[PDB]
Amino acid sequence: FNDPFLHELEKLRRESENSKKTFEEKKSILKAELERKMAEVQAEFRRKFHEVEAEHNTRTTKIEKDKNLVIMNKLLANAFLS
Amino acid sequence: FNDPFLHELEKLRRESENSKKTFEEKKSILKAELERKMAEVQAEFRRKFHEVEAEHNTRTTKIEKDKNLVIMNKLLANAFLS
């Protein structure tokens, strides 16, 4: 640059494009970290939850086998009479 | 319960009622801590964000005041006639 004024002015217009830039990018990084932490906190939830739900379905098919062993040994030892 | 068959049956209604109880309550807890983890991941993203936004607005007024300071200086050294 010839004019040390037009110079300083560009040195600063440039200086504020770096500003606008590193800001725009940080802004993106965070947005993209939050996105990932949230998808991973919700996949940790979905995990434990499908285990809790499994534990129960097995809990109740047990309770289930048995309820029907009762109803059978009853119905059986009772047609032994009629 | 006089009837022993009726007894086995009640013993089971009672067991299935705790299957449901502890399941629904396990469920209720996992959901409670999802709320809590997500709430705080996202309320510390904002804490981190506003700190870049802040950091930028200060950078930018810094520049703005270098600019202004350099323009007026030109304007003054150049404050005459003919």
Author numbering:
A (entry chain A), B (entry chain B): 1732 to 1813
Report text from the authors:
Arabidopsis MORPHEUS' MOLECULE1 (MOM1) is an exceptional TGS regulator that acts largely independently of changes in the levels of DNA methylation and H3K9me2. Surprisingly, only the predicted nuclear localization signal (NLS) and a short fragment of MOM1 of less than 200 amino acids (1663 to 1859) containing a conserved plant-specific motif of 82 amino acids (1734 to 1815), named Conserved MOM1 Motif 2 (CMM2), is required for TGS activity. We solved the structure of this domain and found that it forms a dimer with each monomer consisting of unusual consecutive 11 amino-acid hendecad repeats folding into an antiparallel coiled-coil.
A poor electron density map, most likely the result of the absence of stable secondary structure, prevented us from building the first 28 as well as the last 3 amino acids of the CMM2-containing fragment. The structure reveals that the CMM2 motif folds as a long α-helix. Two such helices form an antiparallel coiled-coil structure. The mutual association of two CMM2 monomers occurs mainly through a large interface formed by hydrophobic residues. Additional stabilization of the coiled-coil comes from an intermolecular network of salt bridges established between glutamate and lysine residues. In contrast to the classical coiled-coil structure, CMM2 monomers are not wound around each other and, therefore, do not generate a left-handed super-coil. The CMM2 fragment forms dimeric coiled-coils with extensive hydrogen bonds or salt bridges mediating inter-chain contacts via residues at positions g and k.
